[PDB]
Write a protein that binds this ligand. Structure first.
Ligand SMILES: *[C@@H]1O[C@H](CO)[C@@H](O[C@@H]2O[C@H](CO)[C@@H](O[C@@H]3O[C@H](CO)[C@@H](O)[C@H](O[C@H]4O[C@H](CO)[C@@H](O)[C@H](O)[C@@H]4O)[C@@H]3O[C@@H]3OC[C@@H](O)[C@H](O)[C@H]3O)[C@H](O)[C@H]2NC(C)=O)[C@H](O[C@@H]2O[C@@H](C)[C@@H](O)[C@@H](O)[C@@H]2O)[C@H]1NC(C)=O
Ligand SMILES: *[C@@H]1O[C@H](CO)[C@@H](O[C@@H]2O[C@H](CO)[C@@H](O)[C@H](O)[C@H]2NC(C)=O)[C@H](O[C@@H]2O[C@@H](C)[C@@H](O)[C@@H](O)[C@@H]2O)[C@H]1NC(C)=O
Ligand SMILES: *[C@@H]1O[C@H](CO)[C@@H](O[C@@H]2O[C@H](CO)[C@@H](O)[C@H](O)[C@H]2NC(C)=O)[C@H](O[C@@H]2O[C@@H](C)[C@@H](O)[C@@H](O)[C@@H]2O)[C@H]1NC(C)=O
Ligand code: CA
Ligand code: CA
Length: 272
């Protein structure tokens, strides 16, 4: 199993290089592209790490390259909890895919916000706005990968109540390489008292999607998800991990977020 973690949304969580040098993570989701679609100039938010809009994030290229040299995949995460994002049409979806390819993946633009190093793919953390055309965005990114002979991984971050309003259509394309289901901030399905509802959601609902790797998404500390869902490490190891590992496409655990992961991933990694 693998551990994926989100990075970008707290300037004190350490550098991307330091995050990779924990050797705890196999995938880094860099969040967030908070404005895109509907003919906007997209906006990337890396909080206080660096300002993308004034070209002060190009240094990240060297750290991305270093992370990748260790076998770590690095994705750009679309969306997040606060933003001005949505797609207005099929053509808008194709235009955003091209923007992502040219600016973050293997293409060229007039100025790439994170420098020349290509990221490995795109994480769909769609939490608000219209749900339309994310299936088309995934399909157009898949085509762009095929046209240039490059791996473009597609990942999705739905919440645990199935089906997810924002991402059900995208996930139903069957094209996502990774889906990390967020079992937090929803007491209908997250860990609460015990793992029964979580495991029922996992086994009965999320098992039915077509993805190559299905991940259990969790908060790294209680403070990471005030709405609930944190599982103490020993309970995760004894009550949850051995059950979900029986699922054929179990891929690991996703953690929100680096800022809150003081020792959670270190405590769980041998059992993931
Ligand atoms: C996983 O966690 C779930 C969430 O906590 C558990 O579901 C909850 O389980 C509790 C305990 O059974 C349910 O509360 C009960 O509700 C009935 C129906 O109203 C009450 O009659 C009952 O009260 C009686 O028993 C109490 C001792 O437990 C006595 O103190 C009381 O005076 C009565 O004699 C009890 O009510 C609770 O009483 C204690 C209070 O602190 C508390 O405020 C009060 O709620 C609760 O309804 C239930 N919640 C839900 C959403 O279902 C779950 O427990 C198991 O699974 C569920 C599906 C049911 O089958 C439960 O009966 C069962 O215990 C637990 N699952 C596992 C596998 O651990
Ligand atoms: C990057 O994302 C941050 C988190 O969403 C933004 O901070 C948030 O901005 C809100 C206004 O849009 C504000 O109400 C929130 O309190 C604040 N949250 C936190 C944790 O700071 C940030 O916005 C910029 O920074 C804040 C502090 C204000 O100065 C805003 O006016 C700024 O736009 C986002 N950065 C950018 C460039 O959008
Ligand atoms: C994923 O897409 C499928 C189509 O490619 C959906 O199944 C189709 O759902 C239609 C309306 O819900 C229904 O009229 C069609 O008969 C059906 N097509 C097939 C080939 O089954 C599917 O919807 C889910 O699955 C079906 C079987 C029903 O149970 C729906 O209620 C479900 O939502 C889509 N899955 C999701 C999670 O959206
Ligand atoms: Ca280049
Ligand atoms: Ca416990």
């Amino acid at each position: 199993g693998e551990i994926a973690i989100y990075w970008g949304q707290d300037g004190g969580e350490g550098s991307l290089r330091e995050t990779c040098d924990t050797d705890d993570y196999d995938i880094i989701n860099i969040g967030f592209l908070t404005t895109f679609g509907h003919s906007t100039t997209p906006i990337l938010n890396l909080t206080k790490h660096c300002n993308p809009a004034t070209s002060a994030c190009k240094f990240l290229s060297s750290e991305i390259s270093y992370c990748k040299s260790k076998g770590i995949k690095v994705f750009l995460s679309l969306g997040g909890g606060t933003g001005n994002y949505y797609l207005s049409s099929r053509d808008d979806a194709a235009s955003v895919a091209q923007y992502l390819w040219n600016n973050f993946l293997g293409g060229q633009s007039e100025s790439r916000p994170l420098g020349d190093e290509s990221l490995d793919g795109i994480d769909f953390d769609i939490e608000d706005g219209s749900n339309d055309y994310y299936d088309t965005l995934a399909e157009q990114l898949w085509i762009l990968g095929g046209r240039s002979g490059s791996n473009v991984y597609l990942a999705a971050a739905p919440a645990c109540e199935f089906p997810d309003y924002y991402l059900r259509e995208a996930i139903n394309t069957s094209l996502f390489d990774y889906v990390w289901v967020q079992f937090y901030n929803n007491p209908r399905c997250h860990y609460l008292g015990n793992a029964t509802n979580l495991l029922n959601s996992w086994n009965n609902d999320w098992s039915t999607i077509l993805t190559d790797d299905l991940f259990l998404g969790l908060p790294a500390a209680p403070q990471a998800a005030p709405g609930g869902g944190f599982i103490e490490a020993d309970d995760l190891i004894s009550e949850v991990l051995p059950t979900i590992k029986a699922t054929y496409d179990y891929g690991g655990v996703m953690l929100w977020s680096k800022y809150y992961d003081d020792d959670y991933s270190s405590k769980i990694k041998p059992d993931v």
